[PDB]
């Protein structure tokens, strides 16, 4: 064919976008040839139901509060002391200028 000399149309790893019926959808979604039984529970639960131990939700600790005055503020200010390290850490990341065809010969992903 006359184009077929440059571009994706002249590449053995090139596919078109007209999937035939048989090759795209040969089994309609309604009447499949199988019988799926989706799971919905684990055996341990289904024969040892115990809802608090399962529902660690609402099993959270209570909210703890404290007030501070000038005395405690001064005490903390004095006992506190920084260090050359562990101030915070830094989240550093930079560009690399990587290729495209590298990963898995440029295939796998």
């Amino acid at each position: 064919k006359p184009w077929e000399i440059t571009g994706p149309c002249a590449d053995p790893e090139y596919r078109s976008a007209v999937p035939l019926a048989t090759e795209y959808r040969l089994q309609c979604p309604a009447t499949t040839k199988e019988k799926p039984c989706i799971p919905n529970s684990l055996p341990e639960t289904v024969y040892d139901i115990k809802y608090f131990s399962r529902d660690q939700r609402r099993n959270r600790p209570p909210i703890r509060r404290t007030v501070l005055k000038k005395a405690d503020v001064e005490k903390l200010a004095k006992e506190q002391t920084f260090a050359v390290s562990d101030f915070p850490p830094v989240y550093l990341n930079s560009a690399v200028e990587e290729d495209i065809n590298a990963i898995g010969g440029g295939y796998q992903g």
Partner: protein, 184 residues
């Protein structure tokens, strides 16, 4: 389990004059401060060479119609360099001119206009321009717990009498409110 470092360092080096409450939860770390020093606190951040936030993500209003300080302004802002985010949450009543942050983060004019009309909280410096979201001359502030869901005057229809008009609400099939509550 996310950003204890930045929060701890920020609290242990701050001028402790302007912090009213600190909550180091796991949902989000909160510096509840006084409305008088808000600009001072935010300008401390974004500049200190460890807890530099440099990006303001949200300025949202919350309404509590049962407390003397009716409103609650909330600033959610992260630190793209130190991979952390904090939530500075201030109180605010009816009319009480709150400081602006459009000088520091220019990305607050639209969020401060939105909190001007949705709620009614003011803003002393520049960002309190006219309303943004709601259409035009609007009676109330349509996100507190008083402006009803269907609005005061909202019928708006064409009139071959003249052209088009806005008239008070007479809607059909009134809003049903189901209860669903559960006394345990």
């Amino acid at each position: 389990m996310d950003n204890q470092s930045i929060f701890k360092y920020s609290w242990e080096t701050l001028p402790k004059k302007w912090v009213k409450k600190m909550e180091r939860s796991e949902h989000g770390n909160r510096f509840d401060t006084k409305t008088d020093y808000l600009f001072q606190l935010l300008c401390f951040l974004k500049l200190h060479t460890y807890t530099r936030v440099q990006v303001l993500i949200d300025i949202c209003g919350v309404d509590y119609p049962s407390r003397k300080r009716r409103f609650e302004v909330v600033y959610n802002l992260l630190s793209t360099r130190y991979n952390s985010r904090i939530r500075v949450q201030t109180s605010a009543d009816e009319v009480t001119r709150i400081s602006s942050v459009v000088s520091l983060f220019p990305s607050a004019g639209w969020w401060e206009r939105e909190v001007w009309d949705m709620f009614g909280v003011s803003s002393i410096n520049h960002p309190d321009l006219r309303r943004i979201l709601t259409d035009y001359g609007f009676e109330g502030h349509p996100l507190r717990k008083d402006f009803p869901l269907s609005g005061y005057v909202e019928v708006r229809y064409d009139d071959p009498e003249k052209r088009v008009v806005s008239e008070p609400i007479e809607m059909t099939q009134e809003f049903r409110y189901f209860d669903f509550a559960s006394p345990w």
